[PDB]
Amino acid sequence: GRECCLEYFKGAIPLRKLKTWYQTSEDCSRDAIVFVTVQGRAICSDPNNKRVKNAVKYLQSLERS
């Protein structure tokens, strides 16, 4: 993986602009979910946060392949 998250976005996931998501490398110090908007903004999130876990559960088909 090329990139890691140093901080977590605490705000509201931008669902209306969401296009894809991925989990950063296991070699990143901070485990993270990155949400990518249609305009390509990338947003680091806490994989243990309840809203993040639910979003990646029901939005499985959005996951980067």
Tokens of 59: 């939005």
Exactly one of 27, 57, 60, 61 binds another protein (CB under 8 A); that residue is 27
How many angstroms separate the Cα of 31 from the Cα of each of 16, 17, 38, 39, 61? 24, 23, 23, 24, 20
- Contact between 2 and another protein by CB under 8 A: the answer reads yes
- Site for another protein contains 15 (CB under 8 A): no
Whose Cβ is closer to another protein: residue 36's or residue 59's?
36
Alpha carbon distance 64, 32 (integer Å): 14
Residues 34-53 that bind another protein (CB under 8 A): 34, 41-45
**Terminal-residue alpha carbon distance, the chain:** 14
Residues that bind another protein (CB under 8 A): 1-11, 24-25, 27-29, 32, 34, 41-45
